[PDB]
């Protein structure tokens, strides 16, 4: 009955770039989401699954935590049925998604005075992502009928673009750490309870 190590997810010193979003399994432990919900530290705590407090009475076979950093205006894209650059090319939730999306304001940590360019997002892809797909390719994006020679210049571009995260950014342009908690009921005894 070990307590789930939520601090390893929510208190993490570093977060993955959204183009290569981190994934961690939570299993065989005692969850507490009420401590998160009542922390009042989160700018957003929204469930598309069971309501934020009703879920505390439920057991699951597992929970997955998807961790990444995006602009505050992009937080709305982290939902089922959404479109836009993050929803289509970096991270996608299925229309059948069950779980919750939690956002935290990291402007005091992830921003840098000259700008923090270590957080990357995908700008180009040949097609939209499948739900929970993680595309980490760095291959130069091709456009047009002419084959790309692997060298940037015209109709050849690096697929990723950095965020310009700075302390002076308006709230919509401030970085937010986002954790998506996906819940599953597999044909197995539950391993996660609270």
């Amino acid at each position, epitope marked *: 009955t070990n307590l789930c190590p939520f601090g390893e997810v929510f208190n993490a010193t570093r977060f993955a770039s959204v183009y290569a979003w981190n994934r961690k399994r939570i299993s065989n432990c005692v969850a507490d989401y009420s401590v998160l919900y009542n922390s009042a530290s989160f700018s957003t705590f929204k469930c598309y699954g069971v309501s934020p407090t009703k879920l505390n009475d439920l057991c699951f076979t597992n929970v997955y935590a998807d961790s990444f950093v995006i602009r505050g205006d992009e937080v709305r894209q982290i939902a089922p049925g959404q479109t836009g650059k993050i929803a289509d090319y970096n991270y996608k939730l299925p229309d059948d998604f069950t779980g919750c999306v939690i956002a935290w304001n990291s402007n005091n940590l992830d921003s840098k*005075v*000259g700008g923090n360019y270590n957080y990357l997002y995908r700008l180009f892809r040949k097609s939209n992502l499948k739900p929970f797909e993680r595309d980490i390719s760095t291959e130069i994006y091709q456009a047009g009928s002419t084959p790309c020679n692997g060298v940037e210049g015209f109709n050849c571009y690096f697929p990723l673009q950095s965020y310009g995260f700075q302390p002076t950014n308006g709230v919509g342009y401030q970085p937010y750490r986002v954790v998506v908690l996906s819940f599953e009921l597999l044909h197995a005894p539950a391993t996660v309870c609270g």
Partner: antibody
Amino acid sequence: EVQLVESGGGLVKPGGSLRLSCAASGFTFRDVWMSWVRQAPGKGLEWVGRIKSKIDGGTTDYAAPVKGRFTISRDDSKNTLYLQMNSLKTEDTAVYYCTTAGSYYYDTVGPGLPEGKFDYWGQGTLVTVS
Amino acid sequence: DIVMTQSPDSLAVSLGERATINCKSSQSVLYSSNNKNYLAWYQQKPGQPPKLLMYWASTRESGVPDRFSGSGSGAEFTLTISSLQAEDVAIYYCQQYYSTLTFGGGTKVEIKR
């Protein structure tokens, strides 16, 4: 204000060994990558080596001219940076500095820099080999 | 190790005169991703440690006069001082962050007399 303190310099016989150290200032030491830079009189700056912050592997790297004769380590409980030099050569005569330079891009430090800047250098200490 | 080189080795400049420092890397410092050039410029005076003026050579650090600006991309860059003052007499150095750390040999800037 932010101030580093350097010590352990002095005359060393060739083929000998020396331990150098630098005390951390008020900025968080443990979360900042640190490096050693040396400058011989009449010469330009030369990088010696680097150590990563605790969140990372904590591994080190060295400039090729000094590799295998130099070891970098730090004591987080004392917030002190150390350099051990072995088999010293007359070529190694230089003023040695401890710095944060180049760390801000790769470290986990946010915008809240105590002086508005992340670039800190010690006054360094002279090491002479002869 | 990546090696940076600089030219001229030294430049005499009269007071109020515009001055530049050129440099060239053994390889590009552009990372493709982020479209950033990992080049910084440092200032050093005798008896003192070097201090940072610009980190990407595209922006100034706090306390740095507006007279200073970097330029260029890829393997080749130039630092420009729109007008030199006596306070600006120093040895200037390039630094690369592309891999480990590298410094150039540096360039001396002095007042012409």
